[PDB]
Amino acid sequence: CIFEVKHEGKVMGYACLVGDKVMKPAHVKGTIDNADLAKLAFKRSSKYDLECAQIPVHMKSDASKFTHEKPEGYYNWHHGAVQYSGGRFTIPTGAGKPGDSGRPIFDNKGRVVAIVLGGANEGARTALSVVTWNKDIVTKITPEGAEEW
Amino acid sequence: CIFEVKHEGKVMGYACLVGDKVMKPAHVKGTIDNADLAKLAFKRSSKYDLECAQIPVHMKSDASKFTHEKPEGYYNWHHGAVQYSGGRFTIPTGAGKPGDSGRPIFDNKGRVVAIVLGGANEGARTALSVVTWNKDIVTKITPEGAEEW
Amino acid sequence: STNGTAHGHPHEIILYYYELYPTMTVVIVSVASFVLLSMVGTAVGMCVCARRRCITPYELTPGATVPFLLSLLCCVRTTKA
Amino acid sequence: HTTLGVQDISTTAMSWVQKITGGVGLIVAVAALILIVVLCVSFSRH
């Protein structure tokens, strides 16, 4: 589900197969290091700093769900455990750096819950700026003073 | 309830006694290998790629009721176990070949859940292209790139 | 001499050219060309606006189609697949 | 005597045809603005 964006042979960010689309932050330079994915036609969206396309039928089995269901508690992400509460995802400051955009925040059943775009440092913890699903539609939560990773 | 369509002495697909009609995919060449069934008058329907007729009174006890009820999980079919999830039936690629159209996908109580028409190969698994019942009415789900069996 | 009939419709309209002239018609033609350019510019703007409408709905999922069709055409033809 | 710069008549008829052109341009201009207005509403909604 996770694929890496390379630029001049160097990993800049990541791309993710969530739902039935293929995501990757718009700000990330490079092209997805995967033939099938690279040749796709992406639709940019500067508001969300998102850039989605549709998953080829032969990889659709490789997507990661998603879900609007996110009860206060702890979620999972590559660097550890994210914490959700008060309508805000946070992490121990330092555990997320530039070049982590695109990385999904899974729950314990594997459903992708949000996609990190950047984070605002508010001391001990950093409030993440994420792309999250509402009732059915996509949304973007950006804490005051976010630093786009 | 299941009867085989033969063409030049060769099984092409199947025919099924569901509800009070006698079904068989329209695309299947041949004639039902059963006197009583073969002499019937079928009504073709190219939208549904279906071709139904009515079950003779002496076989009506032999029909199979169907169902719109299909929760994510595993279903049964002649070659093994089909898997349903994300609104898509799939199987291990290779376990379904041309000449399997018409074969029903039963659940564990025997209710026919869908009827295979063909499948699209998407790697490890093949998403089946089936005829399935909605709230009450028939429907057809055809995954992108299906190969009509 | 040369009769500058009125019409009609147009026809007799070009006849006036002979009456008071060298010019007249060429300027009118230029004006017509300008009008055509305005019409063409409007259409180009309209198509760009139609994209602006189709935007958002470009990312992405269940929700038109629907739009579609209501759809100008393009809506729909993405809606596909 | 007379010879002067128009325009003049052939008037009426002339206006009949002229009136047909440019109206649609105004329409698409207004529609464009309205679309922008709605877009701003969406931007505000977000």
Side-chain angles (χ1 to χ4, degrees):
Chain A
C1 93
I2 283 134
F3 288 85
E4 45 177 46
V5 173
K6 268 158 162 297
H7 184 25
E8 301 183 319
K10 284 188 293 179
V11 179
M12 295 300 293
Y14 288 82
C16 177
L17 311 175
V18 76
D20 77 316
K21 264 73 202 63
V22 175
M23 318 204 151
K24 73 157 290 283
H27 74 267
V28 180
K29 279 65 193 171
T31 58
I32 304 179
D33 182 54
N34 177 288
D36 319 303
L37 279 329
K39 279 297 78 204
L40 294 167
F42 294 64
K43 169 179 297 183
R44 293 182 183 174
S45 176
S46 284
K47 261 165 287 178
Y48 301 131
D49 189 30
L50 208 40
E51 179 175 71
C52 9
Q54 205 224 282
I55 308 175
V57 325
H58 71 291
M59 303 190 130
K60 294 179 179 179
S61 87
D62 294 354
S64 192
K65 307 176 188 63
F66 59 88
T67 163
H68 58 269
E69 283 208 287
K70 56 180 170 291
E72 289 194 13
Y74 297 93
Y75 294 83
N76 314 299
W77 104 306
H78 195 246
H79 299 172
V82 178
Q83 179 195 13
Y84 191 45
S85 81
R88 274 168 65 264
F89 288 101
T90 66
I91 50 170
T93 287
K97 43 193 54 50
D100 273 321
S101 286
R103 297 189 115 114
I105 286 169
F106 300 101
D107 54 26
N108 295 22
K109 270 182 293 60
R111 289 104 114 267
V112 170
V113 181
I115 281 158
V116 178
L117 296 190
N121 183 208
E122 34 179 73
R125 299 182 80 66
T126 275
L128 301 174
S129 174
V130 301
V131 151
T132 308
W133 294 263
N134 248 201
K135 81 100 97 304
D136 81 294
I137 297 169
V138 128
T139 320
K140 183 178 179 180
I141 293 169
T142 294
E144 191 180 69
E147 222 76 76
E148 174 179 88
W149 300 341
Chain B
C1 93
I2 283 134
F3 288 85
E4 45 177 46
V5 173
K6 268 158 162 297
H7 184 24
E8 301 183 319
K10 284 188 293 179
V11 179
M12 295 300 293
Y14 288 83
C16 177
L17 311 175
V18 76
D20 77 316
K21 264 73 202 63
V22 175
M23 318 204 151
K24 73 157 290 283
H27 74 267
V28 180
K29 279 65 193 171
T31 57
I32 304 179
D33 182 54
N34 177 288
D36 319 303
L37 279 329
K39 279 297 78 204
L40 294 167
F42 294 64
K43 169 179 297 183
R44 293 182 183 174
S45 176
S46 284
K47 261 165 287 178
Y48 301 131
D49 189 30
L50 208 40
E51 179 175 70
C52 9
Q54 205 224 282
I55 308 175
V57 325
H58 71 291
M59 303 190 130
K60 294 179 179 179
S61 87
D62 294 354
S64 192
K65 307 176 188 63
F66 59 88
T67 163
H68 59 269
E69 283 208 287
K70 56 181 170 291
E72 289 194 13
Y74 297 93
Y75 294 83
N76 315 299
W77 104 306
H78 195 246
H79 299 172
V82 178
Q83 179 195 13
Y84 191 45
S85 81
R88 274 168 65 264
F89 289 101
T90 66
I91 50 170
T93 287
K97 43 193 54 50
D100 273 321
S101 286
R103 297 189 115 114
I105 286 169
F106 301 101
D107 54 26
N108 295 22
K109 270 182 293 60
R111 289 104 114 267
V112 170
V113 181
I115 281 158
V116 178
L117 296 190
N121 183 208
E122 34 179 73
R125 299 182 80 67
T126 275
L128 301 174
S129 174
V130 301
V131 151
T132 308
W133 294 263
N134 248 201
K135 81 100 98 304
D136 81 294
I137 297 169
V138 128
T139 319
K140 183 178 179 180
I141 293 169
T142 294
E144 191 180 69
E147 222 76 76
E148 175 179 88
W149 300 341
Chain C
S1 50
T2 64
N3 294 332
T5 34
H7 299 301
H9 279 307
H11 301 289
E12 266 178 21
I13 280 181
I14 292 158
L15 297 171
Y16 295 93
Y17 295 93
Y18 295 93
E19 293 177 350
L20 295 174
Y21 295 93
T23 59
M24 294 300 293
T25 64
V26 166
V27 169
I28 298 161
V29 169
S30 68
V31 179
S33 64
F34 292 107
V35 178
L36 313 169
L37 293 182
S38 62
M39 292 313 287
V40 175
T42 59
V44 175
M46 294 300 293
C47 295
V48 175
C49 295
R51 293 182 183 174
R52 293 182 183 174
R53 293 182 183 174
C54 295
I55 302 275
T56 18
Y58 86 166
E59 249 286 341
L60 263 183
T61 36
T65 62
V66 175
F68 296 97
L69 295 174
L70 295 174
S71 64
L72 295 174
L73 295 174
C74 295
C75 295
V76 175
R77 293 182 183 174
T78 59
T79 59
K80 293 179 179 179
Chain D
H1 241 2
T2 86
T3 80
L4 306 156
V6 234
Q7 344 275 320
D8 295 309
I9 348 218
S10 77
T11 78
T12 64
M14 294 299 294
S15 64
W16 291 95
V17 175
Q18 293 177 335
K19 293 179 179 179
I20 294 169
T21 59
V24 175
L26 295 174
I27 294 169
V28 175
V30 175
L33 295 174
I34 294 169
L35 295 174
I36 294 169
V37 175
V38 175
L39 295 174
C40 295
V41 175
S42 64
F43 296 97
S44 64
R45 293 182 183 174
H46 300 291

